[PDB]
Ligand SMILES: Cc1cc2nc3c(=O)[nH]c(=O)nc-3n(C[C@H](O)[C@H](O)[C@H](O)COP(=O)(O)OP(=O)(O)OC[C@H]3O[C@@H](n4cnc5c(N)ncnc54)[C@H](O)[C@@H]3O)c2cc1C
C-alpha cells in the first residue's frame with residue numbers, strides 16, 4: 001500500500017515532496033492535467049502582473065540559498081516559471097488525473113479518480129488550492145476598455161489589480177465599500193527602502209501582547225488623529241472591527257491589500273517605465289487614486305439600478321459600464337467521507353494549524369492557510385515540515401494527535417477568542433504561524449539562549465521566515481547560514497525595527513499611534529507624498545498606453561465625475577488643510593538615535609552591561625525572559 005498520496009501539485013506541495021524524497025519516503029502525486037490559474041493565465045498571455053509579496057517570503061529556502069541577492073517583488077512570470085521548474089523535477093512522480101472522492105478510514109484512505117482508477121494510501125495530503133470567481137474575471141478581462149465607469153462592491157488584491165489596469169485608460173472607479181485595509185508593500189526607514197514584511201518583528205509578542213499591539217495596529221485601527229493618514233482623509237475606508245475578540249494582534253482573520261506607493265514605485269521603475277510595466281510592475285497606489293479622485297468611495301447603501309446600469313450619488317444618476325463583485329475563495333476539496341459514510345464538512349477552525357482536520361484520520365491540508373503579509377511560501381514551507389514530520393515520525397504523529405481536540409480549542413481561544421467562525425479565519429500573521437510550527441516541530445530558538453545583542457536582534461527582529469528555522473537542526477537547508485548573513489548585512493541586522501520597540505516601551509496605544517505618524521514619511525498610507533507625483537503619474541499613464549498599444553482620448557473633461565469627486569472628498573478637503581509642517585520628526589530622530597546605540601553594543605554580552613541607554617539596557621536584559629512566551633496549544637496534555 002502507498003505510504004503517502006499527495007493530491008494536487010502546483011506550488012504548496014513542492015517543499016513536502018522535497019522532504020519526502022530526502023527521507024526516501026514512498027509517495028505518489030495525483031494532479032489534474034488542467035493545471036492551475038497560473039497555467040490558464042500563461043496560455044492567454046495574462047501573466048503581466050507582479051506579486052504583492054516579497055521574494056524573500058515568496059520563494060522557498062532551498063531556492064533562496066542559491067538565488068537571493070537583494071529584496072525585490074517578483075513578477076507573476078518568475079513565480080510561474082519557478083512552479084514549472086519544480087514540476088519538471090517531479091513530473092515522473094505525478095499521475096495526471098482528477099481525484100473525485102476520498103473515503104477515509106481508521107488507518108488508510110480510498111482515493112477515487114475521474115478515470116475510474118482507485119488508489120489506497122495510509123497518509124493523504126491535499127494541496128489543491130482554492131477556487132475564485134475573480135480568477136476567471138481576470139482571465140477574460142479586456143484591457144482596452146476606456147472612458148467608462150466601473151462599480152466595485154468588494155476591495156481586495158484582485159480588485160486592486162483590475163483598478164490598476166483600468167486607471168490608465170481614463171476609467172472612473174466607484175467603490176461601494178464598508179472599508180478596507182491597504183498597506184504600502186514597501187516603505188522607507190530613514191530613507192532606506194523596506195518591504196513591509198521586514199518590519200514586523202513578530203517575536204516581540206512574547207514580551208507582551210500590548211507592546212506588539214502598539215507596534216503594529218496603528219495603521220489598521222483609527223488610532224491617530226494625524227490628518228495625513230488616509231483613514232482620516234477618507235473615513236469610508238474604515239472597517240468595522242467589532243468582531244475582534246482576541247488579544248493577539250494583528251488578529252487572525254484580518255486581511256490587507258499590499259500595493260505600490262507611488263513614491264516607492266517611482267524610486268524603482270521611473271528610469272525604464274515601459275519595460276517595467278511590460279514585466280508586470282503596475283502602479284496600484286489606491287491611496288493615490290483616492291487622492292486624485294480616480295477612485296471614489298461611496299457609502300455601501302448607495303442605490304444601484306442594475307436594469308439601467310446606473311448608480312445614484314451626489315444627486316447624479318451615473319451610468320456605469322460594468323459592475324464587479326468579488327467572491328469568497330473556497331478550497332478545491334473533493335468529496336471526503338468520514339469512515340466512508342458521513343460527508344466531511346471543511347472548517348478552518350476545526351483543523352489544527354490549518355493542517356490536521358480532527359474529523360479525519362491521516363489526512364493533511366497543505367496550502368489553505370493564508371499569510372496576512374508576505375508570500376504563501378513561508379506558510380506552506382513550514383506546513384510541509386509539519387506534515388513531513390507527522391508522516392515520517394510516529395512519535396510526533398502520536399504527540400500531536402493524542403490531545404488534538406485540546407490543541408485546537410487552546411489555539412482557537414488564543415487567536416479567535418469567543419468570536420464565531422468567519423470566512424477569513426484562515427488568514428494568519430506569517431511570523432506567528434511560522435513560529436508556532438517551529439515550536440511544534442522543535443526547530444525554534446530560545447530567547448533565554450541569546451548571549452549578545454546580536455543574538456537578541458536575530459531572535460526578535462530578524463523576520464520569522466521559513467528559512468530562519470532551517471539554519472541548523474532537523475530540517476536544515478544548506479546555504480541558509482550564508483543566506484541569513486547576507487540578509488543581516490543588507491538590513492543592518494534589523495536593528496531599526498528592534499529600536500521601534502525600544503522607542504515605544506513606555507508609551508500607551510495613543511502615544512504610539514502619534515509616534516508612528518510623527519515621521520516625515522510614516523510607513524503606511526501617508527497622503528503627504530502623493531501630490532508631488534502627479535506629473536509622474538501622467539508620464540506613467542502614457543507609458544502604460546504605449547506598452548498596451550492603446551489610444552485613449554484623455555481630453556474630454558468629465559465635469560459630472562468631478563462633481564462626484566467633490567462630494568466624495570468633503571472630509572479630505574476639511575482635514576488635509578490641517579497638515580502642518582514640522583521642525584522635528586520624533587520617530588525619525590528616535591529611531592536614528594536607537595540604531596546608534598544598538599550598533600554600538602552589537603557584540604557586547606548582555607551580562608556585561610545616560611537614561612535612555614539605561615532603560616534600553618534594562619529592556620534588553622528583560623528580553624532574555626519574556627513573560628508572554630506561553631502558547632498553550634504547543635503542550636502535550
Ligand atoms: C491571481 C493570484 C495571485 C496570487 N498572488 C500571490 C502572490 O503575489 N504571492 C503569494 O504568495 N501567493 C499568491 N497567490 C497564491 C498562491 O501563490 C497561488 O494560489 C498558488 O497557485 C499556490 O496554490 P496551490 O499550489 O496551493 O494550488 P494550485 O497551484 O492553484 O493548484 C494545485 C494543483 O492541484 C490540482 N488539483 C486541484 N484539485 C484536484 C483534484 N481533485 N485532483 C487532482 N488535482 C487537483 C490543480 O489542477 C492544480 O494544478 C496568488 C493567487 C492568485 C489566484
Ligand SMILES: N[C@@H](Cc1c[nH]c2c(Br)cccc12)C(=O)O
Pocket residue numbers: 183196197199200215216217219220250373500516523
Ligand atoms: N512596525 C512597523 C511595520 C508595520 C506596522 N504595522 C504593520 C502591519 Br499591520 C503589517 C506589516 C508591517 C507593519 C511600523 O510600525 O511601521
